[PDB]
Enzyme design. Structure first.
Site, PDB file in Angstrom:
ATOM      1  N   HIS A  45       0.853  -1.172   0.000  1.00 14.34           N
ATOM      2  CA  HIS A  45       0.000   0.000   0.000  1.00 14.34           C
ATOM      3  C   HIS A  45       0.896   1.232   0.000  1.00 14.34           C
ATOM      4  CE1 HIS A  45      -3.678  -2.300   0.268  1.00 14.34           C
ATOM      5  NE2 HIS A  45      -3.047  -3.117   1.093  1.00 14.34           N
TER       6      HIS A  45
ATOM      7  N   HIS B 156       5.941   5.913   7.606  1.00 12.66           N
ATOM      8  CA  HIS B 156       5.525   5.648   6.238  1.00 12.66           C
ATOM      9  C   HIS B 156       4.932   6.911   5.682  1.00 12.66           C
ATOM     10  CE1 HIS B 156       1.870   4.955   8.598  1.00 12.66           C
ATOM     11  NE2 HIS B 156       1.308   5.578   7.576  1.00 12.66           N
TER      12      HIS B 156
ATOM     13  N   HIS C 136       1.973   8.726   2.688  1.00 13.44           N
ATOM     14  CA  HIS C 136       0.875   8.693   1.744  1.00 13.44           C
ATOM     15  C   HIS C 136       1.142   9.770   0.723  1.00 13.44           C
ATOM     16  CE1 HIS C 136      -1.572   6.374   4.729  1.00 13.44           C
ATOM     17  NE2 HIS C 136      -0.776   7.026   5.559  1.00 13.44           N
TER      18      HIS C 136
ATOM     19  N   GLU D  47      -3.487  13.105   3.650  1.00  8.58           N
ATOM     20  CA  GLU D  47      -4.707  12.583   4.272  1.00  8.58           C
ATOM     21  C   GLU D  47      -5.425  13.703   5.066  1.00  8.58           C
ATOM     22  OE1 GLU D  47      -3.442   8.689   6.066  1.00  8.58           O
ATOM     23  OE2 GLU D  47      -4.563   8.089   4.276  1.00  8.58           O
TER      24      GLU D  47
ATOM     25  N   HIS E 129       3.887   9.949   8.257  1.00  7.72           N
ATOM     26  CA  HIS E 129       3.366   9.471   9.527  1.00  7.72           C
ATOM     27  C   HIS E 129       4.419   8.728  10.306  1.00  7.72           C
ATOM     28  CE1 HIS E 129      -0.993   9.546   7.846  1.00  7.72           C
ATOM     29  NE2 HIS E 129      -0.557  10.731   8.243  1.00  7.72           N
TER      30      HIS E 129
ATOM     31  N   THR F  11      -5.761   5.351   9.559  1.00  9.66           N
ATOM     32  CA  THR F  11      -6.390   5.791   8.314  1.00  9.66           C
ATOM     33  C   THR F  11      -6.486   4.691   7.240  1.00  9.66           C
ATOM     34  OG1 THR F  11      -4.382   6.524   7.254  1.00  9.66           O
ATOM     35  CG2 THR F  11      -5.549   8.160   8.693  1.00  9.66           C
ATOM     36  N   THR F  12      -6.068   3.466   7.568  1.00  6.10           N
ATOM     37  CA  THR F  12      -6.311   2.299   6.716  1.00  6.10           C
ATOM     38  C   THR F  12      -6.995   1.227   7.553  1.00  6.10           C
ATOM     39  OG1 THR F  12      -4.263   1.026   7.179  1.00  6.10           O
ATOM     40  CG2 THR F  12      -4.161   2.664   5.475  1.00  6.10           C
TER      41      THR F  12
HETATM   42  C1  VZ4 Z   1      -0.564   1.174  12.343  1.00  6.15           C
HETATM   43  C2  VZ4 Z   1      -0.217   2.463  11.590  1.00  6.15           C
HETATM   44  C3  VZ4 Z   1      -0.402   2.295  10.088  1.00  6.15           C
HETATM   45  C4  VZ4 Z   1       0.359   1.323   9.430  1.00  6.15           C
HETATM   46  C5  VZ4 Z   1       0.233   1.155   8.051  1.00  6.15           C
HETATM   47  C6  VZ4 Z   1      -0.641   1.964   7.329  1.00  6.15           C
HETATM   48  C7  VZ4 Z   1      -1.372   2.944   7.988  1.00  6.15           C
HETATM   49  C8  VZ4 Z   1      -1.225   3.128   9.344  1.00  6.15           C
HETATM   50  O1  VZ4 Z   1      -2.042   4.045   9.972  1.00  6.15           O
HETATM   51  S1  VZ4 Z   1      -1.851   5.419   9.924  1.00  6.15           S
HETATM   52  N1  VZ4 Z   1      -1.965   5.920   8.412  1.00  6.15           N
HETATM   53  O2  VZ4 Z   1      -0.575   5.719  10.572  1.00  6.15           O
HETATM   54  O3  VZ4 Z   1      -2.988   5.983  10.721  1.00  6.15           O
HETATM   55  C9  VZ4 Z   1      -0.873   1.890   5.817  1.00  6.15           C
HETATM   56  C10 VZ4 Z   1      -0.404   0.559   5.235  1.00  6.15           C
HETATM   57  C11 VZ4 Z   1      -0.087  -0.473   6.313  1.00  6.15           C
HETATM   58  C12 VZ4 Z   1       0.980   0.064   7.285  1.00  6.15           C
HETATM   59  C13 VZ4 Z   1       1.462  -1.046   8.246  1.00  6.15           C
HETATM   60  C14 VZ4 Z   1       1.816  -2.383   7.544  1.00  6.15           C
HETATM   61  C15 VZ4 Z   1       0.597  -2.842   6.739  1.00  6.15           C
HETATM   62  C16 VZ4 Z   1      -0.608  -3.090   7.667  1.00  6.15           C
HETATM   63  C17 VZ4 Z   1       0.758  -4.074   5.842  1.00  6.15           C
HETATM   64  O4  VZ4 Z   1       1.505  -5.032   6.033  1.00  6.15           O
HETATM   65  C18 VZ4 Z   1      -0.186  -3.909   4.643  1.00  6.15           C
HETATM   66  C19 VZ4 Z   1      -0.776  -2.498   4.864  1.00  6.15           C
HETATM   67  C20 VZ4 Z   1       0.317  -1.804   5.682  1.00  6.15           C
HETATM   68 ZN    ZN Z   2      -0.393   6.684   7.545  1.00  3.28          ZN
END
Ligand code: VZ4
Ligand code: ZN
Ligand code: VZ4
Length: 257
Positions: free
Chosen positions: A61, A91, A93, A103, A116, A195-196
């Protein structure tokens, strides 16, 4: 499975994850005129001097840089937070065009990307337990605009070729996340969610007012990543952002007058 396309994107997520329509979802639009200065906000403390990066991963993603969080090294404290939160990963976006990708929005303005930095509340022992708590995570959000290059980002940009496709990882040690931080730590804060999927309502959001600048070439390299795995039809990893969700019964507080 969920993603960011027409048939599996944000408007579909609520079917597998009904909390998508919950009372404290993220991201949100930050209405700067309605946000109120809060004198009760303690100073904000970002202590990254001992941060130890390990690996960079294309997770299908986005991409993430992961840290050794088995000791209290890099931590976030103060501000709205009670206690100590440990850095585990960051990570991004981003968009297919410079005019979208963030976002959070600020008076409806979208930035080219959003960083983030994800931290978990050490009172819960580890990350998986923390995400089950309403105050389990603190995510420091930083907007990216396109202008001058961010020198501290280039080491990230240059390894992306080695993790083009889903599930690829590469060693990524000795990376210093202080090089991704703007000058000011003025911020807005509110209670929200991941947010996912699974969209858990476990995040204290701290969104910095000052964006960092990255170059057009740096963000172009983000857009060469792939959502797909190796040997699969190529799908460019772009527009991996969720749009603003209803504020509902929440107030956004500002750290600054
Ligand atoms: C837990 C924080 C967080 C982690 C992640 C995302 C968003 C998050 O929340 S946020 N945007 O900081 O609120 C977007 C993709 C996520 C990644 C972690 C590893 C994941 C789950 C996978 O292996 C496949 C999808 C990958
Ligand atoms: Zn994020
Ligand atoms: C998506 C929610 C969720 C994500 C994750 C875990 C547990 C989760 O809750 S749940 N309910 O067990 O699935 C455990 C490992 C986490 C991973 C996110 C990405 C992390 C933080 C890294 O970068 C290194 C460690 C990785």
């Amino acid at each position: 499975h969920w993603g960011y396309g027409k048939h599996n994107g944000p408007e579909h997520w609520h079917k597998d994850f009904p909390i998508a329509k919950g009372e404290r979802q993220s991201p949100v639009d930050i209405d700067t005129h309605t946000a109120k200065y809060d004198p009760s906000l303690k100073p904000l403390s970002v202590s990254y001097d001992q941060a130890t990066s390990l690996r960079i991963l294309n997770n299908g993603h986005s991409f993430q840089v992961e840290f050794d969080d088995s000791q209290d090294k890099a931590v976030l404290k103060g501000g709205p937070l009670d206690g100590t939160y440990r850095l585990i990963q960051f990570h991004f976006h981003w968009g297919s065009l410079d005019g979208q990708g963030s976002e959070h929005t600020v008076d409806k303005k979208k930035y080219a990307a959003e960083l983030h930095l994800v931290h978990w509340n050490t009172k819960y022992g580890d990350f998986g337990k923390a995400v089950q708590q309403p105050d389990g995570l603190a995510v420091l959000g930083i907007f990216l605009k396109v202008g001058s290059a961010k020198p501290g980002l280039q080491k990230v940009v240059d390894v992306l070729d080695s993790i083009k496709t889903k599930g690829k990882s590469a060693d990524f040690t000795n990376f210093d996340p202080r090089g991704l931080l703007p000058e000011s730590l003025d911020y807005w804060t509110y209670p929200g969610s991941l947010t996912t999927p699974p969209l858990l309502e476990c995040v204290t959001w701290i969104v910095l007012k000052e964006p960092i600048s990255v170059s057009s070439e740096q963000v172009l390299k983000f857009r060469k990543l792939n959502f797909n795995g190796e040997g699969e039809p190529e799908e460019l990893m772009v527009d991996n952002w969720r749009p603003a969700q209803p504020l509902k019964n929440r107030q956004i507080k500002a750290s600054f007058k």
